[PDB]
């Protein structure tokens with residue numbers, strides 16, 4: 001039962017607690033909108049975790065790959081994730 | 095048992111098993127990936143935190159306005175989720 005404010009690891013927990021309090025009929029449209037945010041956010045988290053699983057299986061788990069090779073691939077993927085906020089990313093492309 | 099929810103725990107485990115001196119460069123590289131991934135997650139949680147602060151906690155905004163802002167941020171995030179990277183600028 002934390003007294004500290006704006007703890008990042010609790011951000012989704014607090015959104016959930018806010019949703020759970022929206023019981024009045026006039027608050028229902030907001031509640032349904034929040035449900036959608038929550039679903040979309042969870043999908044984002046899942047896809048990020050899959051990025052790790054993909055890296056882990058294709059790079060680290062492969063006995064066929066040399067250590068120098070794996071190190072190269074590992075440095076690359078970190079650099080890519082690092083640049084993501086400055087990346088040009090096109091919605092509904094190709 | 096390799097659920098994606100454990101993806102990070104697994105990477106941290108693998109890092110904790112690279113003990114040979116010749117593996118040390120890969121180990122440091124993996125530490126970097128773990129740090130960068132945690133940063134990614136932290137910034138994602140701050141997205142929720144900032145939305146919560148700016149929209150949901152502002153009781154000067156009507157329920158209608160909060161709803162509109164909540165719908166629009168999800169729409170933006172949904173697009174960002176299917177967006178494909180074509181480059182980055184330094």
Ligand SMILES: [Cl-]
Nearest residue numbers: 065066067068
């Ligand atoms: Cl080797």
